[PDB]
Symmetry: D3
Subunit: 291 residues, 6 copies
């Protein structure tokens, strides 16, 4: 129930105007029953310890709902990003990463941050660069320390539309459940960074050849029965699927599978505990009993 770790930070930054500023940030790690802990970073002037603790607990239960092996975490830096230049924001992000890494609050097997509405992929790129340069230099998984990265930096295809299509799939099956698509795709990005290869790179051509061979088998089997028949032509949509086979297809399929499994589990929990239309309680009971 309670957050087991909470770190309060105070670090100096050297402003462009020529003044020193003290920046205070927070990082709450809720549960270490599953490692690493997954969590976003919020660049807002209204952040507090209570908010990061609550969001870390929510993150833990959200990960438990969609069977993502992550603990809950939440960071927050008490700044207004619209009052700082890009250089100052880069300095703030890199020093925050340094302080978190020194205290064991960042790392591919410890604590993986993610972007937020106030942050973005540039901040994730800065975090990954800072970690790989200084602390995670001798780590082969150094770039798996953060998710939400750009494609050139190790990001995953299909991350921008992850939350919306997760919401769509959750609605189609029928907060803790509907808003979990981004968490699943961040888990997939973490896996892809650990794999050091994109999804389907070794599989696409092989599966294409196997499908064509199956269609040729149907061809020849129907030609043997009666003496012209062409059961080798794929449908139009199958042809676009074959031609445009990429990582986003695998990511979308994994997201849909995860959402379907979680919806079935929530339905079964709601039936077992004699709940009606109160799906929030069913999801929370499922997450609590999984943890």
């Amino acid at each position: 129930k309670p957050c087991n770790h909470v770190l309060s930070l105070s670090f100096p930054i050297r402003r462009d105007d020529g003044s020193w500023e003290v920046i205070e940030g927070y990082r709450a790690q809720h549960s270490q029953h599953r490692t690493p802990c997954k969590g976003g970073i919020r660049y807002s002037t209204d952040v507090s310890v209570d908010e990061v603790k609550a969001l870390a607990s929510l993150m833990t239960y959200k990960c438990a709902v969609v069977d993502v092996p992550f603990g809950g975490a939440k960071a927050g830096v008490k700044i207004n990003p619209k009052n700082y230049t890009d250089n100052e924001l880069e300095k703030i992000t890199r020093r925050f990463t340094m302080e978190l890494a020194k205290k064991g609050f960042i790392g591919p097997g410890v604590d993986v941050p993610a972007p937020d509405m106030s942050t973005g992929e540039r901040e994730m790129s800065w975090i990954a660069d800072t970690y790989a340069s200084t602390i995670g230099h001798y780590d082969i998984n150094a770039h798996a320390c953060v998710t939400g990265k750009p494609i050139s930096q190790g990001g995953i295809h299909g991350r921008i539309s992850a939350t919306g299509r997760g919401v769509f799939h959750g609605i189609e099956n029928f907060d803790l459940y509907l808003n979990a698509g981004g968490v699943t795709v961040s888990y997939f990005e973490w896996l892809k960074n650990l794999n050091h290869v994109s999804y389907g790179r070794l599989t696409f051509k092989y599966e294409r050849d196997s499908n064509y061979h199956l269609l040729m088998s149907v061809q020849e089997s129907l030609e043997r029965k009666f003496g012209g028949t062409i059961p080798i032509v794929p449908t139009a949509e199958f042809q676009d699927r074959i031609s445009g086979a990429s990582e986003k297809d695998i990511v979308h399929s994994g997201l849909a599978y995860t959402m379907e499994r979680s919806a079935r589990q929530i339905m079964r929990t709601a039936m077992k505990y004699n709940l009606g239309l109160d799906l929030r309680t069913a999801a929370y009971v499922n997450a609590i009993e999984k943890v």
Copy 2:
């Protein structure tokens, strides 16, 4: 041929009645040509250095037979498990893990223990917790240090059957070969722990859609030749159960069957090459020695 790393341990535990007891343990590592080593832990009063060394050699040859890239290992703690409570067994297991980890005899890349007849998944969970908490805390593969874990702790689906399913497949194809199936599944669990994902998590839905599209293609190609009446789309019943119930167990079973078939073929080829009629044990041992 000989075991190259035998470790004898004497460690103290506190009893439930408030006494102190010295516990003796042994860990044998036969070969490090393949890393990590792999082997079980026996809680028995009849354990000895000779037994663990022989079982480590057997583990090496068994892993070589089924193409599992593990060295042979074997542990033994000279206790009778039916004389201690669950708390004392917890303490014994955690202290044994601590000593083995300090002496470099357990780890995801050096030595992976497994359960036994006198040992279960609770001991494996205790070992994994102890290692991931103290020595392997700053290691992303900390929970790959042991196999036979519960599902919630990182265990693999399809481990209970394993040995029996492997025995069935070995008989179907036609000790060092027939009894290796469980070992194979343990290997898979190790890989799963290094993957940080369950098998088929990113593949099941994609393959299901591809199969449905293939059936769509057959349907639309046949409806062009003759005539909507033709429906080469509905899967066969059992194929529908396979689609609906696709899980990690299916992949584990398929991998086990593939490994058993490959090993049986290799053993038959070795028995033919060296002119061994019905003594398949000699053929399997020759195959394992040649591989090692």
Copy 3:
């Protein structure tokens, strides 16, 4: 453009006759935007620092072209291999590995060497054994420190024909592009060594069962509609299933990489209005990817 790191080594070896010889070597790492670096090791008397730097730059651009996430590297040892025995070459290789690994120029996540014209799989076996025994002993990826290894040492199936198969695929699609196929396969070997399992080990039987079930469904539907036998795969499909191995997956991945990078080069050549100068298109593609 310039090489980030150049390391020069002078190390001693004890010959069979009992004399002491000083061996010169040098490793160039061009770029570290992608980790690890990747490059070959050349045993020759005509090697120079300029040669290894140029080949490291070419290695970086070659990796960029075929979307291989490796930096460029290249090593050279100033010896004539036809002047030393097998024991002397083993000693030279192992000491070179020790010196390179002490200074951070060998490692699964740092810098991966590969064989060359004057080196082979037996040199890579020595490198991997030396690294896994001394410096990278407590490293689960110790054998991913080098590629071009034998099958028993963790090598990949399909390595021998990699360069020629890539050349054929590149010609079929239509130096930086055509000669990259082997590099791609080396990448796969690295991935295999990080996976601790061979490709298709857990997939072949499952895919075979799925294909047979699909053909069974075709039989069931056709027999219910109108018996007929659309379950038998064709002979080529039949020996594809029977002979399903890791080298099939390696070949398919090589073909996929070649086809994708050929499309990328064609698109780059069209956009910058380069009619038949595909070398410039490939270099522009690689530069803009880096």
Copy 4:
């Protein structure tokens, strides 16, 4: 001025009766300009974040005053030790050490804790044993992870006096200054643990031989001057000092030297800024300008 890091901990323990209990804890590191940080651990039910931060700042300034190269730190566990048996107190101490060492808040070159009024040498023994057993085994200086240990566990001779001897020396020379004897003795214990040898082990006999040779030289020169005399014999108190030469003599001499130097520096600062009798301001100015 502000504390750099504050860590909040919630960890579970098993009671003797067999009931799970959540224990709250805090550790503040004020400054990391000097490494390692140094600070005590208080087992009290009235501990709070504000108190540990204030005491960490005070520890930083106290260490700066007596030229001890440590940063300020302070830990507090919100328990009443009078309500726990020795076994569960041991469990609490070991688990607190485990979490603090996991998140980089205990270490020979990171953070050294010390006993308090509510803690003692047994808690320090538990902390040292826990750290040496689990987190640092390949650390050759794991013994130096904590101070205030017993002699058999690597403690320093003269630790009991420490504070009183420093108070007496400070009064004789004429809070931030008078109460810093224990900090200096803990610094000496840390140095002794890093040295892996007790003070004077390789020096006492050599110094005794040198002193006797000097006395013999004076004797022989006097006998040669006038044709005997007995300068060989030391005085009573010098003979007791020679016979009873131990490590605590060196510790006492070092403490006296540190107190004298700090008193001289504080007097110089008070003269420079024209402070008559407000020695607290002079000491704080000295510490601030040192940091």
Copy 5:
């Protein structure tokens, strides 16, 4: 009481004629309550687990007697050194060091080996070079992995005469106590290797100047009390040789004498407290057990 760690090794070497040989080795660590462990290595064909365990226990108690913060250890390689060339011995020593280092049985903070009657400073140099080159490469204290090294390789001055000097001092004060001078000097060598400086390097000239100033003070005070008439400034002969030849061996000898004197006092105190007669062995063992 029992040895808590025993490691058995079987490792291959290649001889000059090319034949492969399997070499057996043992290393027993008795007590880890005081780290690092400390013990010698014996090259003999009559080595066994029982002898190395007994000698490790003896080493623990001997270190406890002379207040040396080391646990007891003992190693043995089952070879006859008079049957191998220097190259073969170098290979055997280096491979033994590698196997011990991979399993955590040698290290500056883990376990420090020492020479013996069948082993010398040459094998110590080989061990130190092997450890500092492969496993302890990124360790600032890789020098302190072993003791008994040559002076140029990090050895201590006053090591050859250590045992005899300790025996003489023990007799002067009046096995576990009399034969412990080598252990004390090996402890001093370990400390010197950790310090990265020789004893007295930064102190000799300072003490010389202070000693010459004290005598000058006495001379000037006497010249003021009475009517350069008096010369107290000159030291006596033996003091002059002590000043001129001040080196590390003097400090080592003084430390050894201090340790032996303190241990003799403690043994006398123990023999008086428990009312023991002329049997000092029992008093020494009781003292060592009480300290442990």
Copy 6:
């Protein structure tokens, strides 16, 4: 004879005007027979790899002459420091340190740099801070990676006059020998940083009390012999030595000891090989046979 390792670096820096610049550097490591290597860094546009190799060899032989257990090393950065501001010079120094430390060319047990004529103690501060912040953070000896630091950063007293005092001592005893005082004092600074304490901190008061007790012994013995007499008061020079006992006294005494011993060894070598006034050949022969 040859240098074992020569590293060539090309790294980018950002200028104040807003332009990227490529900076070339290189560090030669002569021999690893005595870890760590030791050598200075020259910020000069005329540096070449041949000069750094020659100076590394000279450093090896110079260290061998004065019994300093360091291998030779030498670094050079091809910039003219007069063309850069302090900010971009700090950036250059920090990035050079980063690149050198990533590939095992900076470290307390690997390779210790030192200042030069074109490089001062502020560059040493930058190097030490960069190393202790990024790669050597979990190293207890992180601040021993470099010498020539300021006193507040872990520098040694008596470092400024080291070369001149060594030259004077060498002349009084009678390049490879005369110019080795700075190397010895840098070795003492490395030892001081390893010890984590100043020289004489735990010794000065003890020696003072011992000297006063010896004078008391002489006084009492002479009073008991003939009937008073005052052979207790130290001389003027001894009184200032007692009052002003500092670490620089120990450093000066160690330097004098090293110079005297090296002069004796060079004289013995010159006699042994029948060399006359050619002491340079004697010093080189001594260094060669010591290595």
